Ligand binder design. Structure first.
Ligand SMILES: NC(=O)c1ccc[n+]([C@@H]2O[C@H](COP(=O)([O-])OP(=O)(O)OC[C@H]3O[C@@H](n4cnc5c(N)ncnc54)[C@H](O)[C@@H]3O)[C@@H](O)[C@H]2O)c1
Ligand SMILES: [Zn+2]
Length: 346
């Protein structure tokens, strides 16, 4: 009847490790036992209690949303899920009713609620989950990889928004999302994959994951280096994984005419851009990326996991046993000292 949870108990910095009642799954819900769980930048912002989290979180609430778990209990009415199923969780809870949903664009549902943001999450021993947000995992995939499927899906949709095999690529940003992008891009045949990242630690991770070239944009002229690599032609594909305004401008300069751009990173505010010369006169195709395409992106992610071609080990920089060191985990992330952190549960 009791379980450990990482909990945002009240407004302010940080979180508390508490013991609470194991939830009961009601109609259309299942209860999973958590096997592995990982920390998202969203979780960090809730911990730090920034302006966004202030506008969005009602304490008290269990934190976290990336998960690998086992179904232990089914709520009434639930079909198609059985006790013992190995599962992960899609966080967009969609209405099924708006124009976006009815066109099959669930990832931009007009009435979206976010699991672990608008609801209790998964940094706990057990979690209740809407049954329609359950993804069944093949048993071959280890929990430490299965827990990365949400951000891995974001990375898949950014990388694969167009053709990528045999394409030259610039990635700006090698935080966890960008690192996962590198892994996806290399497993999908991109070369050369050029990665721009000012942090020395993350830039070296990008190389271990598989970047063909790395660039420190605080010391090197990104666009000039990219012109050297691509013999003056620019990259076929530009993937923006940093949310830095200057990186957006560099990638739009570095991309080949009529090339393709995917934008995942989110900027501190509005950006000021030369649309005439960089987007219009270059005839670019630009994709904004958010969420995951439900369920095609999850099938793609699942096969890429099973193929063994994603080089994910270098990205998991910290694997903790249970939740006791959550304070240290969140502080290391804040410091930029991380790839992904995984909590492993007994
Ligand atoms: N739905 C979405 O569009 C969605 C989903 C997931 C994440 N995100 C966003 O994706 C971005 C990446 O997420 P993350 O968790 O990996 O973030 P993160 O902050 O850990 O990493 C961003 C990286 O960008 C690097 N960087 C800063 N300035 C740069 C510059 N000028 N050029 C190149 N790199 C630079 C930083 O050093 C950092 O390593 C963030 O903006 C995040 O908000 C968006
Ligand atoms: Zn909808």
């Amino acid at each position: 009847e009791k379980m450990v949870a990482i909990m945002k108990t009240k407004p302010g910095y940080g979180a508390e490790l508490v013991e609470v009642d194991v939830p009961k799954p009601g109609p259309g819900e299942v209860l999973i036992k958590v096997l592995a769980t990982s920390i998202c930048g969203t979780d960090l912002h809730i911990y730090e209690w920034n302006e966004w989290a202030q506008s969005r979180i009602k304490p008290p609430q269990i934190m976290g949303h990336e998960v690998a778990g086992e179904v232990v209990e089914i709520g009434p009415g639930v079909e198609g899920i059985e006790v013992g199923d190995y599962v992960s969780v899609e966080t967009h809870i969609v209405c099924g009713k708006c124009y976006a949903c009815r066109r099959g664009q669930y990832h931009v549902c007009q009435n979206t609620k976010i699991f672990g943001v608008d609801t209790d999450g998964v940094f706990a021993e057990y979690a209740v989950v809407p049954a329609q947000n359950i993804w069944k995992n093949p048993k071959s995939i280890p929990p430490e990889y299965a827990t990365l499927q949400e951000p891995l899906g974001n990375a898949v949709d950014t990388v694969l928004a167009g053709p990528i095999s045999g394409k030259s690529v610039l990635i700006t940003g090698a935080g966890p999302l960008g690192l996962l992008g590198i892994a996806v891009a290399k497993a999908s045949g991109a070369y050369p994959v050029i990665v721009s990242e000012p942090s020395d630690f993350r830039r070296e991770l990008a190389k271990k994951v598989g970047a063909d070239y790395v660039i420190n944009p605080f010391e090197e002229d990104v666009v000039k280096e990219v012109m050297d690599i691509t013999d003056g032609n620019g990259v076929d594909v530009f993937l923006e994984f940093s949310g830095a305004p200057k990186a957006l401008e560099q990638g739009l300069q570095a991309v080949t005419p009529a090339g393709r751009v995917s934008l995942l990173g989110l900027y501190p505010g509005k950006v000021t851009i030369d649309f005439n010369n960089l987007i219009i006169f270059k005839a670019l195709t630009i994709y904004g990326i958010t969420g995951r395409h439900l369920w095609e992106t999850w099938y793609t992610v699942s096969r890429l996991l099973q193929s063994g071609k994603l080089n994910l080990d270098p990205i998991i920089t910290h694997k903790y046993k249970g939740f006791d060191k959550y304070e240290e985990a969140f502080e290391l992330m804040r410091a930029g000292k991380t790839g992904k952190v995984v909590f492993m549960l007994k």
